[PDB]
């Protein structure tokens, strides 16, 4: 019971036993690639994921606020 109160208090401090990348997402085939290859241009057509992190662009919401 006393562990639940510590954790709850650390959460007010934005402290958790878990963070991104620590535990397996399920609870794989990606590979590194070839060094010294060519680095090619591509189109920045639509807002990339990075800009939702920055805040320059936001996801729509089904919400009206007055």
């Amino acid at each position: 019971q006393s562990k639940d109160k510590i954790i709850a208090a650390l959460a007010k401090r934005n402290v958790y036993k878990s963070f991104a990348g620590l535990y397996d997402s399920k609870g794989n085939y990606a590979r590194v690639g070839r060094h010294g290859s060519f680095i090619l241009p591509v189109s920045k057509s639509v807002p990339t994921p990075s800009l939702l992190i920055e805040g320059s662009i936001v996801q729509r919401k089904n919400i009206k606020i007055e």
Binding site: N28, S37, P47
Partner: protein
Amino acid sequence: MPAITCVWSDGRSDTWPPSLKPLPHQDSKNLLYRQICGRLLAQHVFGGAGSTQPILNQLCKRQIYLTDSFENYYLASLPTNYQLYQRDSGNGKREFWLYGHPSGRPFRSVNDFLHHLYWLISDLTRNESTCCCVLCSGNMTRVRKNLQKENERMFHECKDDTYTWPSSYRLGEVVWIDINNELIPAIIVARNLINYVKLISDTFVEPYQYHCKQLGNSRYYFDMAAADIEPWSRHPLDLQKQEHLVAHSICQTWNLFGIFQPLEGIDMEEPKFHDENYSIPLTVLPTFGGESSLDDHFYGIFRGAEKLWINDLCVISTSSLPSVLQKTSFMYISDIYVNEDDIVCFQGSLWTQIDKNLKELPRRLQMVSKLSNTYFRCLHDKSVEYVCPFADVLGRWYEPWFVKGDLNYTSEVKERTSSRLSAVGSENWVDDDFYEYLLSEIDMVSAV
């Protein structure tokens, strides 16, 4: 007092029905119900688990305009076709039931309805499978709730590592600790903001207390300052020093994390809500979870000792790269994904930095410019970006003040793992007492 309305509703009037007493819009308890929904909805859509944006805002206080105190928001109206009720208990306590859900069952607490309410305003595809509420998910509700919470925290961990508090060490990284002139191998286990013009500059340099776990030892080291921590690539590890072999083993691994579905351009827009008293743009919580493509996209990746993110700055090999781009100091990462050849690719813009001794820059670089004599320029057309494999990413880019000296100790990153904990090994991670100690160490100082 901002009033919130739902754009759409799945409510069905014909689900409406041990007595039940209707609570109309005017009832003081219906209002309280809609006040709780509005406050917590507002804190979810414009916040979410793990947000530290209020800390940066209150530090900066020293389209639609809106107050940022979400305790004032409230539902102008319940979603169409939903009806609230008071039900008498034998336990006695009163319960407030909300009918309307297509299943024909009530939400017996405001807390259970909130998850469905949040799905109504967030899921733009109106896909019933993405809701965490009890009536759409049944027994999967805890699992879905937990994952959502983890994802919300991941987003804010990403934002903090690249936007809010970027000049810092990152959770799970392997670093060098310097205590009493001793170089100690350690891993960042936890960190907290320190409760407090020059206030904003000192916070940008030293925003965190770090709490670490020595590698090869059972020793905890709490309340570490960045001034006493150096990146793993600053000093060499010793081959004959047996206890250094845990840090050597971890810094050869890498693991992707934080899979998500990129958003379509039609589901995005310019910031619409801002702070009415300071014009700060509100942080809108994205809900990536959906259905899609042959490319899997990822929030970030551990590269040996360091953590890397989308929206982050990283060093890349300039060897195989046209003459026009060899001044490249770092890539500003836009996207991290596994292509259809199963290769991890980094996509972003390439920049050079000039030490003399802002509209179009990310906040991280805007601050580096204000706090140093360093100038940044993009080396290519604003409308294209470049893609290199993970093989050509060398490590993190650090702010110019972050490291006295240079980083020449590259490591051979050649082993993929499913998790950071898997590469660390549970015997080398912390025990539950760590967090008991931590709480005592930061009980007074840390931000809340």
